[PDB]
Amino acid sequence: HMLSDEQMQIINSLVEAHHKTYDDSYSDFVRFRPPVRRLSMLPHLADLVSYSIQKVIGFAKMIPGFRDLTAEDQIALLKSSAIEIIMLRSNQSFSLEDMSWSCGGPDFKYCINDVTKAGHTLELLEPLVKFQVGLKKLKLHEEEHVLLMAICLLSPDRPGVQDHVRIEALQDRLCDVLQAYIRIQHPGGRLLYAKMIQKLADLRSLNEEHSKQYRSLSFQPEHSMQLTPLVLEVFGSEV
Amino acid sequence: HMLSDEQMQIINSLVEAHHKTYDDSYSDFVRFRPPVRRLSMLPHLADLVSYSIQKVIGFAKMIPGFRDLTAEDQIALLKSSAIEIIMLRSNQSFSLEDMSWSCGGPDFKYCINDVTKAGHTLELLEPLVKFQVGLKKLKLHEEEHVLLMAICLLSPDRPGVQDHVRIEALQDRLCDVLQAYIRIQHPGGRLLYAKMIQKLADLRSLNEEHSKQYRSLSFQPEHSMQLTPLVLEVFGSEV
């Protein structure tokens, strides 16, 4: 057996959307408030995350079917999955040699400690690094990585989603595209699909922990003032 | 005649508050989103203005009497005068040689054109530069400049102020301190006080124009997203 034209077009559109919304040089990082090493890394990391939300929105808008959902479902899906898509996309900068995200030079090399200086704890950072190491070891094809992000985004089990039948259908269409890609194009991927679906479960708990820690930060006006309007809106409680 | 102990203590406290909230080296400017020359200067200038609001709050809290007003009057006074205090304090960086604010190097030298790239027009920038030139020519003593800022801050004629009798009294106490300072300590200041009070009238119209232009910017989410939580709150319409 082989992939159909429709399945192939889905892969093409997703890979192109990722190439359009992810810069491997990290050249836009010089435009953020600079890194500093009380929560010295918060301005830089808030700017980094704000920039990445914009990219995730860019990517999302090109996922086949996403543009057809209501502005409400689009927002509900973006709000609840943004941090998970940010965690997935960050894997491309993660290095197993130094257990860090390497984004250009000495300034943009981020370790656990730097994120601690952004108001985060090891209750989040220890499983994040473990998730990063695990996902990195899966040696995903660009097609699988892009499909995993789109699958994550289109999870119907999110607070605020209204049309859980239409989102579940788009997600299943994407899950079949992934399953077939691994079967046809990935030699030795016999257990990959399962391992990948298990990574989405990991993201849910990482998401829960981030939200808790973010709520703490967002409630202290001296820290919330260092965030951006986009971060506040996306990670905020408004309906 | 001469200044009294009380009048002298007011001058001492104000000069000290300004020395504590104004850096002549402009060394904190490297921590802002960098200058870029669609509204390329907005991130840098929003960060600059956000930083300056913080300083104006710092200064305000040390103006004798201000701390005794209700949190409501303190907010109402800060909200409506912030841009005027920013305009006054910026005079210390204004240069008559190049008609610009020189804050360190080639990156932090700001001309009319740069502010145009922050969503502002010559309807604001032409009278601003004319105001800057005029105030600069007054060759104010540090004591007069600090008194002018405090006088501006304590203007009772502001939207939202409740105790206009207590604010008017603090402002008059400050106006007498200024009048006496010029009389005793400023040789040739016979017409200075009037010229200074006239600069406050200028600030009202400059404030009105800035608010109009800012409302335009704040209504476009692509521009409002580049502002900071502090700028949005201070220049915002909430009561």
């Binding site: 927002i75 973006l78 809106e233 | -």
Partner: peptide, 10 residues
């Protein structure tokens, strides 16, 4: 509300 997100989604 969600003013920014609405704009960014066009």
């Amino acid at each position: 509300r969600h003013k920014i997100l609405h704009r960014l989604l066009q």
